[PDB]
Amino acid sequence: APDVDLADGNFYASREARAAYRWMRANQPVFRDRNGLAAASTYQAVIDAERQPELFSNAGGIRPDQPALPMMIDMDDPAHLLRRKLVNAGFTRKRVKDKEASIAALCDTLIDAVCERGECDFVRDLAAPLPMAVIGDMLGVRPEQRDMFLRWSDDLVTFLSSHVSQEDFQITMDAFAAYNDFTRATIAARRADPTDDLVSVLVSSEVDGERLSDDELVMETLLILIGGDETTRHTLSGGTEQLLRNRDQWDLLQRDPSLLPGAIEEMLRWTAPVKNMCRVLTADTEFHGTALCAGEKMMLLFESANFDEAVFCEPEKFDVQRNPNSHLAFGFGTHFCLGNQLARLELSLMTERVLRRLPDLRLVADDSVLPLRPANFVSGLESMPVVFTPSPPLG
Ligand code: HEM
16 A cells, blocks of 8 residues: 555645555555545545435544534534524625626736736735635725735644644634634624624524524634635636646637636646545444444545546546536535635636736746645645736736
């Protein structure tokens, strides 16, 4: 077997991870790593676990060596369902679709900031700022305070993505304290004088005589911040990278905008920014050939599932036309990403504008192998230098 530690962020920063996944799928689909940690590597195993939440629970927390927090993603039904219905008020199909104009304007502003230069870092300048600006605007964050939230988000993702030192633990707690303070200020303000922002909508949400408490509002908005920021970033950067590495794909999209929805799905399949979520076993079970024990956690390897040849023909081919494309980047089942529509909307609006406004975009070096973030949870490109013919801003 490959000698790997699936809780080590260095594994996921390796471009040989998919080679390891390939071995797992072919030889021990429910794999145990060098330390005995169990992981579902095939699409079939991931789906089968997702469909059995009573056996494969979220209530032990979704990271391998960390306890549950009081938030939707660390809950099982029926409690989870109530929490999700409450928060869903902020993510109805209509409410998300109505953000189109505002998100488009953010995209044009971001491209305006670099279009005259002829070069930018696609990650720093386009992929990273968009998701935080979208969430920031929902949360009432002033534009000049976005970078503060970007840092807190990175701190928290880092905490979820490793076993932190004492120092980094304190940094995480301090970031949470700051987020908590900010959010409680917003909650107090909105409970008194409602606007149309996210905290306002969540405060007014009601399900079967139940409402979100201040504690729950802090936790659920935090989950939204962390869940929707760096994930979206990595699909935007890594997905655009594949368009640039395969010019035929870039060319297809540019000459046919109707192919955009399929392109976004392939970007999602390929990038799988969430590399795993954990499930805790509620009983001993024989699962796709591997004996699992009550109380242990098993990873769902979403990237591995997304490259499973049982489901995706020639999975190492990036193909924007792929149909079907039933990837698991957003998971499956009762915890299926609540923000999936918003993420898709951001990715579509920015990609449409990149294709249009930076039509000859290319990677600084076509032979570059760019670094991935060492993290065991959410990961993608650190940097992506790109060049293009300059143009005047739209303003
Ligand atoms: C490309 C971007 C994103 C990816 C790849 C992603 C991925 C995921 C995954 C894998 C899960 C857990 C699914 C499972 O275990 O089966 C999840 C859950 C969740 N996501 Fe996302 N996500 C993205 C963007 C967002 C955004 C923009 C939001 C904004 C709110 C968001 C909010 C949430 C929430 C609240 C949950 C918990 C759902 C539940 O437990 O019922 N995510 N996401």
